[PDB]
């Protein structure tokens, strides 16, 4: 198809976790959770990420146990039979803002805001695409294109017209530690947090990968040596043919 229906290819940014030895910036994961809680939690669900994965990564155990109390969850009904509600504990999932799909479509002019738990893993480009899509809203669409009303223009979205308005403005949140909150800083922090949500096994996976490729490379070289050793009796055999005497 044409390039407008393909979507503009997102560039190759220099992330802090692009590399065979680098890990996630966990301060960026903490700041990205603050950006997700204050900005993206009005539309987007995140329901494959429990509260217990959040400890030891971005917040501490007391902070996550204090953050889980602010939401109510379905508890099994009491002695009479009528249902009860309870404050959340560490085992429950992070709650979505909309109770079903139909309210999510009704509160966003028909467009369902997708679940963000696997959103940098289920897109072509990944974190580069998410960051450039967040920062890629122009102040005006180009001269000639016509959009349906209520639909905003974003060139990195495949199709040209996304139904999500530009939300990341300057000084929308103020951070807990003192980093300045621009649109690019907030965008980078929230997509590093989305990459942590899509792959929590990143650090452990790359460490076990370092172990496995060191062990298997040394094993490959030693097996090459022992193959040449066991085959040195065959690579240097010599054949001598004197012609036999006739009968």
């Amino acid at each position: 198809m044409t390039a407008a229906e393909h979507g503009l290819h997102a560039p190759a940014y220099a992330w802090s976790h692009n590399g065979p030895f680098e890990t996630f910036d966990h301060a960026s994961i903490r700041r990205g959770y603050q950006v997700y809680r204050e900005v993206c939690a009005a539309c987007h669900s995140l329901d494959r990420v429990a509260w217990r994965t959040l400890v030891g990564v971005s917040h501490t155990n007391e902070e996550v146990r204090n953050m889980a109390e602010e939401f109510e969850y379905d508890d099994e009904p009491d002695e009479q039979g009528n249902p009860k509600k309870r404050p959340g504990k560490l085992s429950d999932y992070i709650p979505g803002p909309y109770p079903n799909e139909q309210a999510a479509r009704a509160a966003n002019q028909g467009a369902l805001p997708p679940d963000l738990s696997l959103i940098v893993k289920a897109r072509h480009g990944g974190c580069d695409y998410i960051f450039s899509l967040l920062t890629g809203y122009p102040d005006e669409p180009p001269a000639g294109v016509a959009l349906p009303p209520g639909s905003n223009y974003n060139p990195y979205f495949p199709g040209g017209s996304i139904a999500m308005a530009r939300v990341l403005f300057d000084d929308m949140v103020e951070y807990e530690d003192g980093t300045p909150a621009t649109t690019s800083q907030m965008a980078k922090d929230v997509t590093t947090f989305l990459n942590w949500c899509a792959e929590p096994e990143h650090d452990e996976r790359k460490r076990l990968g370092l172990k496995t490729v060191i062990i298997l490379s040394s094993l490959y070289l030693l097996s090459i040596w022992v193959k040449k050793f066991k085959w040195a009796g065959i690579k240097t055999r010599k054949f001598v043919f004197n012609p036999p005497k006739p009968r």
Partner: protein, 126 residues
């Protein structure tokens, strides 16, 4: 898969007519020395597949000296392909000693088996 009588017939017709000969044998000589079975020290009649009945009888009818030289050339080709080298320039099979030695036995064995096949599918005039 292809009978050697047919290959011999097409090759004889290509050879003994002088228009096709001077056009077909130079590219055949270039194809043979580009193939590279002589750099391993092999005649061509070692390369033929020995798992037909025709080739098995044509090998069991081979004389006792050419059979031993054939076995040595096959084993030497196996070894110098094992070590991933080639034979040196002294031990290359020259083009004048790439004589077809198995081909009369192959031709007469396939002629005998062919004659059996069309003698037992014969019909008297009815």
């Amino acid at each position: 898969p292809q009978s050697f009588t047919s290959i011999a017939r097409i090759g004889d017709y290509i050879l003994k007519s002088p228009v096709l000969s001077k056009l077909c044998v130079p590219v055949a000589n270039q194809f043979i020395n580009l193939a590279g079975y002589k750099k391993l020290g092999l005649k061509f009649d070692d390369l033929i597949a020995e798992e037909n009945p025709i080739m098995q009888t044509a090998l069991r009818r081979l004389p006792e000296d050419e059979s031993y030289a054939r076995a040595y050339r096959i084993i030497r080709a196996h070894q110098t392909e094992l070590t991933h080298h080639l034979l040196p320039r002294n031990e290359w099979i020259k083009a004048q000693e790439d004589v077809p030695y198995l081909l009369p036995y192959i031709l007469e064995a396939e002629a005998a088996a062919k004659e059996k096949d069309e003698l037992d599918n014969i019909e008297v005039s009815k």
